[PDB]
mmCIF file of C-alpha atoms and ligand atoms in Angstrom:
data_model
loop_
_atom_site.group_PDB
_atom_site.id
_atom_site.type_symbol
_atom_site.label_atom_id
_atom_site.label_comp_id
_atom_site.label_asym_id
_atom_site.label_seq_id
_atom_site.Cartn_x
_atom_site.Cartn_y
_atom_site.Cartn_z
ATOM 1 C CA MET A 1 19.017 311.857 291.051
ATOM 2 C CA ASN A 2 21.815 309.295 291.526
ATOM 3 C CA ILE A 3 22.575 305.661 290.522
ATOM 4 C CA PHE A 4 20.449 304.264 293.372
ATOM 5 C CA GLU A 5 17.388 306.400 292.551
ATOM 6 C CA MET A 6 17.941 305.697 288.845
ATOM 7 C CA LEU A 7 18.070 301.901 289.221
ATOM 8 C CA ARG A 8 15.175 302.006 291.709
ATOM 9 C CA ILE A 9 13.055 303.614 288.966
ATOM 10 C CA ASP A 10 14.225 301.137 286.305
ATOM 11 C CA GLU A 11 13.977 297.990 288.439
ATOM 12 C CA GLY A 12 11.013 298.709 290.759
ATOM 13 C CA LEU A 13 10.605 297.157 294.222
ATOM 14 C CA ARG A 14 8.885 293.824 294.842
ATOM 15 C CA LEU A 15 9.179 291.897 298.130
ATOM 16 C CA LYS A 16 8.081 288.498 296.810
ATOM 17 C CA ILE A 17 9.892 286.344 294.224
ATOM 18 C CA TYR A 18 8.780 287.418 290.735
ATOM 19 C CA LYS A 19 9.909 286.836 287.143
ATOM 20 C CA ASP A 20 11.891 289.641 285.491
ATOM 21 C CA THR A 21 11.561 290.839 281.857
ATOM 22 C CA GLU A 22 13.509 287.758 280.667
ATOM 23 C CA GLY A 23 11.338 285.374 282.743
ATOM 24 C CA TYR A 24 14.010 284.834 285.426
ATOM 25 C CA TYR A 25 13.285 284.570 289.143
ATOM 26 C CA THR A 26 14.103 287.878 290.810
ATOM 27 C CA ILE A 27 13.327 289.741 294.045
ATOM 28 C CA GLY A 28 13.672 293.192 295.623
ATOM 29 C CA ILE A 29 15.120 295.908 293.418
ATOM 30 C CA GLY A 30 16.060 293.830 290.364
ATOM 31 C CA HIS A 31 18.036 291.220 292.306
ATOM 32 C CA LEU A 32 18.394 288.294 289.909
ATOM 33 C CA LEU A 33 18.264 285.024 291.848
ATOM 34 C CA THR A 34 18.867 282.452 289.129
ATOM 35 C CA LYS A 35 18.279 281.691 285.475
ATOM 36 C CA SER A 36 16.970 278.248 286.535
ATOM 37 C CA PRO A 37 13.303 277.541 285.721
ATOM 38 C CA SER A 38 13.054 275.941 289.194
ATOM 39 C CA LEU A 39 11.250 278.043 291.809
ATOM 40 C CA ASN A 40 12.865 275.845 294.480
ATOM 41 C CA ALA A 41 16.310 276.698 293.088
ATOM 42 C CA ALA A 42 15.387 280.405 293.220
ATOM 43 C CA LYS A 43 14.196 280.067 296.829
ATOM 44 C CA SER A 44 17.471 278.345 297.750
ATOM 45 C CA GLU A 45 19.434 281.231 296.195
ATOM 46 C CA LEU A 46 17.267 283.699 298.110
ATOM 47 C CA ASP A 47 17.807 282.029 301.493
ATOM 48 C CA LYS A 48 21.571 281.940 300.833
ATOM 49 C CA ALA A 49 21.592 285.617 299.763
ATOM 50 C CA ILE A 50 19.635 286.765 302.846
ATOM 51 C CA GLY A 51 21.105 284.312 305.360
ATOM 52 C CA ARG A 52 17.791 282.887 306.586
ATOM 53 C CA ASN A 53 14.959 280.526 305.615
ATOM 54 C CA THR A 54 12.635 282.932 303.765
ATOM 55 C CA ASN A 55 9.098 282.054 302.631
ATOM 56 C CA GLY A 56 10.105 283.528 299.234
ATOM 57 C CA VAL A 57 9.345 286.899 300.866
ATOM 58 C CA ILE A 58 11.783 289.541 302.149
ATOM 59 C CA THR A 59 11.521 292.902 303.939
ATOM 60 C CA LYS A 60 12.184 296.305 302.375
ATOM 61 C CA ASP A 61 15.382 296.576 304.445
ATOM 62 C CA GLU A 62 16.527 293.187 303.089
ATOM 63 C CA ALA A 63 15.683 294.270 299.498
ATOM 64 C CA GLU A 64 17.731 297.440 299.988
ATOM 65 C CA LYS A 65 20.674 295.464 301.397
ATOM 66 C CA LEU A 66 20.827 293.233 298.298
ATOM 67 C CA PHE A 67 20.466 296.377 296.170
ATOM 68 C CA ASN A 68 23.437 298.051 297.864
ATOM 69 C CA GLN A 69 25.512 294.900 297.279
ATOM 70 C CA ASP A 70 24.412 294.703 293.650
ATOM 71 C CA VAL A 71 25.221 298.352 292.864
ATOM 72 C CA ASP A 72 28.623 297.871 294.549
ATOM 73 C CA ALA A 73 29.160 294.687 292.488
ATOM 74 C CA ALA A 74 28.344 296.485 289.206
ATOM 75 C CA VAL A 75 30.867 299.254 289.977
ATOM 76 C CA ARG A 76 33.430 296.632 291.089
ATOM 77 C CA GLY A 77 32.819 294.699 287.823
ATOM 78 C CA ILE A 78 33.385 297.816 285.715
ATOM 79 C CA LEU A 79 36.638 298.701 287.493
ATOM 80 C CA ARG A 80 38.038 295.115 287.212
ATOM 81 C CA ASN A 81 37.191 294.864 283.514
ATOM 82 C CA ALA A 82 39.854 295.880 280.956
ATOM 83 C CA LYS A 83 37.263 297.040 278.418
ATOM 84 C CA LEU A 84 34.891 298.844 280.790
ATOM 85 C CA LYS A 85 37.333 300.585 283.138
ATOM 86 C CA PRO A 86 38.857 303.047 280.585
ATOM 87 C CA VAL A 87 35.373 303.996 279.361
ATOM 88 C CA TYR A 88 34.088 304.524 282.917
ATOM 89 C CA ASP A 89 37.169 306.593 283.822
ATOM 90 C CA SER A 90 36.658 308.775 280.748
ATOM 91 C CA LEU A 91 33.050 309.655 281.674
ATOM 92 C CA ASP A 92 31.423 312.347 283.821
ATOM 93 C CA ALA A 93 29.402 311.281 286.907
ATOM 94 C CA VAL A 94 26.000 311.211 285.143
ATOM 95 C CA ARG A 95 27.229 309.043 282.262
ATOM 96 C CA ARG A 96 29.082 306.839 284.762
ATOM 97 C CA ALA A 97 25.656 306.112 286.298
ATOM 98 C CA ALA A 98 24.319 305.135 282.849
ATOM 99 C CA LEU A 99 27.166 302.621 282.435
ATOM 100 C CA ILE A 100 26.582 301.175 285.935
ATOM 101 C CA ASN A 101 22.897 300.849 284.997
ATOM 102 C CA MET A 102 23.769 298.738 281.908
ATOM 103 C CA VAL A 103 26.128 296.526 283.927
ATOM 104 C CA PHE A 104 23.486 296.055 286.645
ATOM 105 C CA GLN A 105 20.984 294.877 284.013
ATOM 106 C CA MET A 106 23.144 292.745 281.682
ATOM 107 C CA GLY A 107 26.355 291.983 283.594
ATOM 108 C CA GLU A 108 30.011 292.963 283.169
ATOM 109 C CA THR A 109 30.700 290.503 280.324
ATOM 110 C CA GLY A 110 27.577 291.529 278.394
ATOM 111 C CA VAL A 111 28.337 295.260 278.464
ATOM 112 C CA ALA A 112 32.069 294.705 277.813
ATOM 113 C CA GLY A 113 30.939 293.142 274.514
ATOM 114 C CA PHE A 114 29.473 296.429 273.188
ATOM 115 C CA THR A 115 32.852 297.221 271.563
ATOM 116 C CA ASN A 116 31.693 299.808 269.042
ATOM 117 C CA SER A 117 29.380 301.663 271.468
ATOM 118 C CA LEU A 118 32.151 301.721 274.071
ATOM 119 C CA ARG A 119 34.575 303.265 271.548
ATOM 120 C CA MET A 120 32.053 305.992 270.608
ATOM 121 C CA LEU A 121 31.445 306.727 274.297
ATOM 122 C CA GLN A 122 35.202 306.928 274.900
ATOM 123 C CA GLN A 123 35.386 309.316 271.910
ATOM 124 C CA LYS A 124 32.540 311.437 273.372
ATOM 125 C CA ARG A 125 30.571 311.088 270.113
ATOM 126 C CA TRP A 126 27.327 311.124 272.090
ATOM 127 C CA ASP A 127 24.751 311.101 269.277
ATOM 128 C CA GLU A 128 26.670 308.387 267.411
ATOM 129 C CA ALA A 129 27.031 306.321 270.606
ATOM 130 C CA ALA A 130 23.297 306.746 271.260
ATOM 131 C CA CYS A 131 22.384 305.501 267.771
ATOM 132 C CA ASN A 132 24.778 302.551 268.033
ATOM 133 C CA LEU A 133 23.510 301.505 271.493
ATOM 134 C CA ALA A 134 19.959 301.218 270.106
ATOM 135 C CA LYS A 135 21.097 298.586 267.573
ATOM 136 C CA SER A 136 20.890 295.819 270.161
ATOM 137 C CA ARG A 137 18.811 293.023 271.619
ATOM 138 C CA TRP A 138 18.915 295.146 274.812
ATOM 139 C CA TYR A 139 17.124 298.077 273.186
ATOM 140 C CA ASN A 140 14.582 295.891 271.354
ATOM 141 C CA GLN A 141 13.624 293.844 274.425
ATOM 142 C CA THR A 142 13.524 296.751 276.937
ATOM 143 C CA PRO A 143 13.066 299.837 274.739
ATOM 144 C CA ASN A 144 11.676 302.267 277.341
ATOM 145 C CA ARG A 145 14.418 301.506 279.878
ATOM 146 C CA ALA A 146 17.105 301.474 277.160
ATOM 147 C CA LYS A 147 15.778 304.809 275.873
ATOM 148 C CA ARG A 148 16.219 306.344 279.345
ATOM 149 C CA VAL A 149 19.758 305.007 279.704
ATOM 150 C CA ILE A 150 20.662 306.057 276.145
ATOM 151 C CA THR A 151 19.234 309.577 276.697
ATOM 152 C CA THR A 152 21.473 309.768 279.785
ATOM 153 C CA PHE A 153 24.553 308.899 277.667
ATOM 154 C CA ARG A 154 23.461 311.283 274.898
ATOM 155 C CA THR A 155 22.879 314.340 277.100
ATOM 156 C CA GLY A 156 24.864 313.797 280.301
ATOM 157 C CA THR A 157 21.724 314.944 282.151
ATOM 158 C CA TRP A 158 19.026 313.232 284.211
ATOM 159 C CA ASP A 159 16.257 314.493 281.874
ATOM 160 C CA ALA A 160 14.951 310.955 281.173
ATOM 161 C CA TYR A 161 14.392 310.368 284.918
ATOM 162 C CA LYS A 162 12.697 313.668 285.808
ATOM 163 C CA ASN A 163 8.974 313.442 286.622
ATOM 164 C CA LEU A 164 9.484 309.715 287.335
HETATM 165 S S1 LIG B 1 20.271 306.229 264.887
HETATM 166 C C1 LIG B 1 19.953 306.810 263.253
HETATM 167 C C2 LIG B 1 18.669 307.618 263.260
HETATM 168 C C3 LIG B 1 18.576 308.844 263.764
HETATM 169 BR BR1 LIG B 1 20.086 309.925 264.259
HETATM 170 C C4 LIG B 1 17.130 309.302 263.905
HETATM 171 C C5 LIG B 1 16.947 310.783 263.199
HETATM 172 C C6 LIG B 1 16.688 309.342 265.311
HETATM 173 N N1 LIG B 1 16.450 308.241 263.095
HETATM 174 O O1 LIG B 1 15.198 308.268 262.772
HETATM 175 C C7 LIG B 1 17.338 307.145 262.715
HETATM 176 C C8 LIG B 1 16.917 305.828 263.364
HETATM 177 C C9 LIG B 1 17.436 307.004 261.197
HETATM 178 CL CL1 LIG B 2 12.722 294.403 287.576
HETATM 179 CL CL1 LIG B 3 23.840 287.710 296.508
HETATM 180 CL CL1 LIG B 4 11.527 298.822 278.934
#
């Protein structure tokens, strides 16, 4: 298991524009195109992202390219952020993946806002961090995915992603 395999499980793979859990136009492996309710706007974002006039459909290779960029962007976002960087630096490799996962899903600013959870993570109070993380819109809206990510922070193992 690694961050790519982890996010691939959590995000799935779809080669045609679809709406994510929040109803936003998305493609590939959880690549958010736009929050605009306009399919045309989403298609424009897609063509720009891929560098060609797509019929709202991409190849697996193209999906994986966007995915690579997006994982890179999440890590980059964590390292540039004054709140996220110290937490990330304090974590082991498995828990680092859990933090990247959160940033991939909700964005740098969103995760940076989890002040109390971040402190507990920094303190290595894993059970307490786990409980605090669950007290969120994130957990309530995507409970199975949040449970997997939280289990990863709680245990520092890939147990939540085995047999998946
Ligand atoms: S997060 C607080 C709780 C814990 Br530690 C367990 C035992 C899982 N619970 O049922 C809660 C929600 C009270
Ligand atoms: Cl998805
Ligand atoms: Cl992009
Ligand atoms: Cl879920």
